[PDB]
């Protein structure tokens, strides 16, 4: 999955997936990927 | 082996000692390896000196596993008192009513206290369930330097943060001293048409509303919702609450004193039953209160880790690690034209069941200006005009360019009534509307036809859309109403905005 | 007339000098009007002999404030806590004298509490002024699961958004967990080398103990910490070059005493010129009826600022807990401590020492150090990103596009 | 309809784009149903 | 093409309910007003306030 702003079954607790899934719990901290711009993804990670 | 448990009662409660007794009475092997001695005392009143000397005497004569305490006073210190001699005497203590039943915030890790009651945090997530159901997604937070306080804006921070839903929230309000003095008028002064949360005390909410009509943020348009510790003891209602003031609280209406007695002696029999099919036996009572025994006093099997996970016969009545009912009994309750305390809604198993569908305006006051600018729509589904869907299951609310709608849908032919359900409403001429709404500034509660179709007059009695109309059930009737003669005769309408003819459909 | 005031204390001679600084207070203020009483009970190893002998002696004799100390025995596992409840019952107020604990800064659980010591928690505010002097701007915390640690780490964290930083990471820990390697292994690989520990005395040793067996307490790295872990068991496993705090008048109990005495018996002064002044309640049995002004005795005790105390000004903030006290900044140099600094109300001041960080160095180390070795994330797209299966040896056959270049692979 | 079936890779950028539009909300449900995990296999299903 | 959205008429006292819920509706950033001098000191107070 490239990413997706999704809720967590349990509390109901906003989560992403993939590569910002990845990025923000620290085990990655830059991609190189495909990987679309929009305001969604922005608002939490910052693109070149 | 016999498990023995004592019940304190007060005097202020008409329940006697062999009622609470006959209460241990189903008879229908609830204890599968044990057997439940239960016994009874009522106190005077309830005080440091007396409340230990009791526990510690129930404690030395009936050995007693376990306590339950139903409190009749509204004194808060009694709950640490009941938390500490848990913490002194590692026996379960369950907090059932009174001061027992009002909330401390952080039990102490080595004491078996359990409450009958819900955090603030529990109360917050009701507010926005509330909030999230009448879409009232734009809010103010007014609060002062009661403790708690921090820990409740934090929690609604983090939530607003965690949820879906716009939650447009405005502004931050911490009013630390000096009510109407001043350094507090100017920040309750840019507070807009907006539900404003209030976390406070009852003698200070009083002030607050005060301050609040003073400045006019009580009109029709304007929705407080606010916990339990400011509505409090609910017979005694002071004349500064305007009406419509939404509040959550620990039901006492419904959920009597016996039934908590028998919730509480059924969770601890299903923990001693749970500990014995896990552990070997039920540890014995500690020697004494006093003496000041040279041991660590820690047991080496516990009930604390047992009243996690409880299923009585119907309920789920489980605790948090913290302390706290998994499932906890709040009902919604609203000041009514009245001046009392009617409930409006419940808090089952994480779902909110609300009475009223669409909110009801309430008169905050005598003097308050009349509502003109609300106004009651019709609309009845059409495919190319009024489409009607159900919620969003992602959102759980009305998705963009929709708006909230109330359908009143049947149970089944059976039955003559049915319920109001909120569906959302997108369309032509629902965007119409929004664009009306916009432009004219007016509010509505747009709801769906029930009684006709398009309208028609049957024995000299209008149905649907001209039927609602003409009976001053609605202000307009928004929707695919073609111009007509009779209609025009019965109902003023406006200049129509798109050509709507008969015609002939063929097949090619 | 007569105005009884109730102090539970550790000795006797505690409880003598505290009847002295009663006399003095009731000299200076003066006695013609009213005369300040003094009763005092010594310390009890059972806490429900506490809540008895408190209702007993204190309630009974109808007291307008409670003095509660520490044991003479080093242990302080909530000892003030019975009083604290049961004159919470009237609302009668208590004044901690070195009661440090920040559970007691709860207002909703203690609902009448007053201390002239702060608590566990403020510490993080003077650490504050560190990163504001070092420059330091990624931080890395260690605060237990108690409510001690979740307390500091919230009130760190509302003290870091005013300037719109957060911590990198906020590792936790259960109290009194023998293995915590886990942890400062997780630590290790992140990028901050701001290291701030909130813990007790024995989690702060094993913590230390951890830490040394990984290398982390060499050059480039930096410790900040509070008084529990600079004090017993915990100084004997710290590393050199650690940071700590020691107040000023935290164990002297007789100044402490001295300065309580004199702000209570200043606010029953200004108390005692209102209207409508409803007497004490008068023994534990019989009365379970608050304290009408209990209440409003609390307030003026919370506005009342004390002129000249011995252990400086004193003054209360809205929590109830002492505001703008003197932390003497602490430093380990070759196993021996010694101060490098003294932090005010507000602001930190150095002096003439120098400061010998960890691993032997004396200049100021950089808050953190940049790793270059970068964790990278991609997934299989077939026109940007093409992965093939290794072969046995590794790797995976090379090729050449159609200009002959060999293809760069990873 | 349900004869013309077309779909994308779930929980990618084009995802939260059809969900954001206001007039292709309807599309949306179509699109859910379908959604598939890679875009390897998207391009397979479309190729046979 | 001008925009003159509502006209606002201070009939009562400038400190009570009215004149409150009144002026919040001001949206725009020029308002015409016109009083006396004493007047006008309490509306531009409590416009500031």
Redesign the interface.
């Known amino acids: 999955?490239?990413?997706?702003?999704?809720r967590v079954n349990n509390s109901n607790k906003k989560e992403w997936?993939?590569m910002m899934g990845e990025l923000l719990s620290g085990q990655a901290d830059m991609i190189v990927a495909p990987?679309?711009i929009?305001n969604?993804?922005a608002q939490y990670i910052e693109f070149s | 082996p016999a498990l023995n448990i004592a019940v304190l009662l007060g005097h202020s409660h008409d329940v006697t000692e062999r009622e609470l007794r006959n209460l241990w009475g189903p008879e229908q092997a609830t204890g599968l390896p044990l057997d439940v001695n239960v016994v009874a005392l009522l106190m005077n009143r309830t005080d440091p000196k007396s409340l230990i000397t009791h526990v510690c005497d129930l404690m030395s004569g009936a050995r007693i596993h376990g306590l339950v305490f139903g409190d009749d006073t509204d004194q808060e210190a009694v709950a640490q008192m009941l938390d500490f001699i848990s913490s002194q005497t590692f026996i379960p203590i369950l907090g059932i009513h009174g001061g027992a039943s009002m909330i401390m915030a952080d039990k102490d890790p080595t004491s078996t206290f359990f409450q009958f009651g819900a955090s603030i945090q529990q109360q917050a997530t009701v507010m926005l369930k509330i909030m999230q159901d009448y879409d009232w997604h734009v809010f103010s937070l007014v609060t002062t330097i009661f403790p708690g306080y921090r820990d409740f804006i934090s929690f609604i921070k983090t939530t607003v943060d965690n949820s879906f839903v716009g939650w447009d929230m405005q502004n931050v309000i911490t009013l630390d001293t000096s009510f109407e003095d001043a350094k507090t008028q100017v920040q309750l002064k840019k507070i807009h048409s907006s539900v404003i949360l209030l976390y406070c005390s009852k003698d200070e909410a009083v002030l607050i509303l005060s301050e609040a009509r003073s400045l006019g943020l009580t009109g029709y348009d304007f929705f407080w919702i606010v916990p339990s510790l400011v509505s409090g003891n609910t017979e005694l209602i002071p004349k500064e609450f305007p009406s419509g003031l939404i509040s959550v609280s620990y039901d006492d209406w419904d959920y009597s004193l016996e039934a908590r007695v028998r919730d509480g002696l059924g969770i601890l029999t299903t923990a001693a039953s749970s500990m014995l099919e896990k552990f070997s036996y039920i540890p014995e009572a500690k020697a004494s209160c006093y003496g000041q025994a040279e041991k660590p006093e820690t047991p080496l099997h516990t009930l604390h880790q047992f009243m996690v996970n409880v299923t009585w016969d119907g309920k789920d009545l489980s605790f948090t690690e913290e302390g706290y009912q998994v499932h906890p009994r709040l009902v919604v309750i609203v000041l009514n034209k009245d001046r009392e305390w009617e409930k409006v809604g419940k808090w089952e198993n994480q779902t909110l069941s609300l009475r009223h569908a669409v909110w009801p305006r309430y008169k905050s006051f005598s003097d308050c200006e009349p509502d003109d600018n609300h106004l009651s729509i019709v609309t009845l589904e059409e495919a190319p005009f009024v489409i009607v869907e159900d919620i969003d299951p992602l959102t759980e609310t009305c998705?963009?360019?929709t708006v909230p709608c109330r359908k009143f849908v049947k149970i089944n032919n059976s039955t003559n009534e049915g319920m109001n359900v909120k569906k959302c409403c997108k369309g032509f001429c629902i965007d119409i509307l929004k664009k009306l709404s916009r432009t004219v500034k007016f509010t509505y509660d747009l709801y769906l036809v029930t009684n006709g179709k398009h309208g028609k007059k049957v024995n000299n009695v209008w149905n649907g859309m001209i039927g609602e109309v003409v009976y001053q059930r609605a202000v307009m009737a928004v929707g695919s109403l073609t111009i007509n003669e009779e209609r025009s005769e019965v109902v003023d309408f406006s200049v129509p905005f798109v050509e709507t003819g008969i015609s002939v459909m063929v097949s090619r | 007339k007569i105005v009884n005031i109730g102090a539970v204390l550790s000795t006797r001679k505690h409880e003598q000098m505290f009847r002295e600084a009663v006399n003095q207070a009731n000299k200076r203020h003066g006695s013609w009007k009213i005369q300040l009483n003094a009763t005092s009970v010594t310390h009890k190893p059972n806490a429900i002999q506490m809540a008895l002998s408190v209702c007993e002696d204190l309630i009974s004799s109808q007291v307008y404030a409670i003095l509660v100390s520490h044991p003479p025995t080093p242990n302080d596992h909530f000892t003030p806590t019975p009083v604290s409840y049961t004159a919470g019952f009237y609302r009668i107020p208590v004044l901690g004298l070195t009661t440090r604990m920040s559970i007691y800064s709860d207002k909703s659980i203690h609902l009448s509490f007053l201390r002239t010591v702060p608590p566990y928690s403020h510490q993080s505010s003077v650490w504050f002024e560190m990163m504001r002097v070092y420059n330091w701007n990624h931080i890395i915390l260690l605060v237990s699961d108690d409510h001690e640690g979740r307390a500091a780490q919230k009130r760190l964290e509302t003290l870091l958004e005013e300037r719109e930083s957060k911590a990198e990471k906020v590792l936790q820990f259960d109290p009194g967990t023998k293995n915590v390697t886990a942890l400062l292994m997780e630590a290790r690989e992140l990028e901050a080398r701001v290291i701030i520990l909130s813990a007790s005395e024995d989690d702060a040793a094993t913590v230390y103990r951890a830490a040394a067996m990984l290398n982390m307490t060499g050059s480039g790295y930096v410790w900040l910490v509070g008084e529990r872990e600079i004090s017993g068991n915990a100084l004997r496993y710290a590393p050199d070059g650690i940071i700590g705090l020691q107040l000023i008048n935290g164990k002297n109990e007789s100044a402490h005493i001295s300065d309580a005495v004199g702000v209570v018996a200043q606010a029953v002064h200004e108390l005692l010129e209102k209207e409508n002044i409803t007497d004490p309640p008068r023994g534990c049995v019989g009365n379970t009826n608050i304290w009408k002004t209990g209440p409003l005795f609390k307030r003026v005790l919370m506005s009342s600022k004390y002129a000249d105390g011995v252990t400086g000004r004193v003054e209360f903030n809205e929590d109830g807990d002492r505001k703008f006290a003197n932390y003497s900044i602490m430093n380990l140099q070759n196993r021996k401590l010694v101060q490098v600094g003294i932090y005010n109300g507000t602001h930190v001041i150095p002096n003439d020492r120098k400061i010998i960080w960890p691993g032997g160095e004396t200049e100021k180390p950089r808050g953190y150090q940049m790793s270059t070795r970068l964790k990278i994330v991609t997934i299989?797209?077939?026109p940007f990103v093409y992965v093939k299966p290794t072969m046995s040896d590794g790797t995976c056959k090379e090729e050449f596009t159609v200009n002959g270049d060999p293809v760069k692979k990873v | 309809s349900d004869k013309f079936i077309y779909a994308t890779?779930?929980?990618?950028?084009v995802?939260?784009?059809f969900r954001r539009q206001?007039?292709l909300?309807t599309m949306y449900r179509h699109m859910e149903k379908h959604n598939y995990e890679?875009?390897?296999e998207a391009i397979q299903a479309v190729r046979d």
């Open positions: 999955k490239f990413g997706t702003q999704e997936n993939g990987l679309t929009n969604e993804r | 998705v963009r360019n | 299989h797209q077939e | 890779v779930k929980q990618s950028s995802d939260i784009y206001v007039e909300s890679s875009a390897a």
